[PDB]
Design a protein around this ligand. Structure first.
Ligand code: GSP
Ligand code: MG
Lengths: 179, 131
């Protein structure tokens, strides 16, 4: 019966709600509602311990910047997200999310999470990306960004593939439990 | 309406709440109706609970001063929420809880409110959505 609070942040449309929902309900948001404020809950077993994770979902749209301070107050772990089909979303990690998270949640551990790991090899994406001298984000890059911002760890996953999802939240819970 | 008349005359007369935009809200604005009222607990930032009369009209939070009511004065926050600026949500953690957000551009505020029962929380959430 241990309680911890996890907050997810990142650019709009980078897959945060899908990751939370897929993890908390195994379902998958079909009708895509941009987020304003939501919270969910899930129970996770880690290293023998039962933990109840409160999952605070936030807006990626900058139009809602002023509401996000309302999710930070008692955070045990941050999932700081970008999307692998959007090297833009990655460059916003140091520019926007890391400065805000460090302001509101100093000393709160951060998991840097690359979402949509499946689309790394989808031509639709990988061609549009080529259409602008771009290409999906690469693990060395994600990992370098994680070292740069001081993250507790680096993790990659696909809500749709579902691959690695579980591993994102095990790592986050290990960080939450960390003194 | 009857209940509303008495609540009103029970409200202490010099009482007001500061809004984030620097305006004020005083009992006089209540002279200009009451949809439902109920006793709840307001969780402060430090995890303390404040006993509160919540009135859905906007949302208004009252504290008791013996047989008088005053506009709540909890952690420098406004005790009145405009319904047009209101975001309302279930506390996933707490079947009795709801989160009530004033999204005011002068400075948003969170209010985490706990009722006595799951049924009463869903009762509050239904009545709040209509407005
Ligand atoms: N292929 C693939 N698509 C995904 C994946 N995750 C999310 N998507 C899709 O991308 C869109 C955005 O996902 P969503 O989870 O709603 O983003 P968000 O980060 O919550 O966006 P916001 O609320 O800040 S505006 C959705 O329509 C969703 O189905 C994924 O892992 N793989
Ligand atoms: Mg979302």
């Amino acid at each position: 019966a241990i309680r911890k609070k996890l907050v997810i942040v990142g650019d709009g449309a980078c897959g945060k709600t899908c990751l939370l929902i897929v993890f908390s309900k195994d379902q998958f948001p079909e009708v895509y509602v941009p987020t304003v404020f939501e919270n969910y809950v899930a129970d996770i077993e880690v290293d023998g311990k039962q933990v109840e994770l409160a999952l605070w979902d936030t807006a990626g749209q900058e139009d809602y910047d002023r509401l996000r301070p309302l999710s930070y107050p008692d955070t045990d772990v941050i999932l700081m997200c970008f999307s692998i089909d959007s090297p833009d979303s990655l460059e916003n990690i140091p520019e926007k999310w890391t400065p805000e998270v460090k302001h509101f949640c100093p000393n709160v551990p951060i998991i840097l999470v690359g979402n949509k790991k499946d689309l790394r090899n989808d031509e639709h994406t990988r061609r549009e990306l080529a259409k602008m001298k771009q290409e999906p984000v690469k693990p060395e890059e994600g990992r370098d960004m994680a070292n740069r911002i001081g993250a507790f760890g680096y993790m990659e996953c696909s809500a749709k593939t579902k691959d690695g999802v579980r591993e994102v939240f095990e790592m986050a819970t290990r960080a939450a439990l960390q003194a | 309406n009857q209940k509303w008349l008495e609540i009103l005359n029970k409200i202490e007369n010099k009482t007001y709440t500061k809004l984030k935009n620097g305006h004020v809200f005083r009992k006089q604005a209540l002279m200009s109706t009451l949809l439902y009222d109920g006793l709840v607990y307001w969780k402060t930032a430090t995890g303390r609970f404040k006993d509160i009369l919540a009135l859905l009209l906007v949302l208004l939070f009252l504290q008791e001063k013996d047989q008088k009511y005053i506009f709540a004065a909890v952690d420098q926050k406004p005790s009145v929420i405009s319904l047009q600026k209101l975001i309302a949500r279930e506390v996933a953690n707490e079947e009795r809880g709801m989160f009530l957000i004033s999204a005011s551009s002068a400075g948003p505020e969170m209010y985490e409110i706990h009722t006595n029962s799951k049924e009463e929380r869903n009762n509050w959430m239904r009545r709040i959505q209509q407005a």
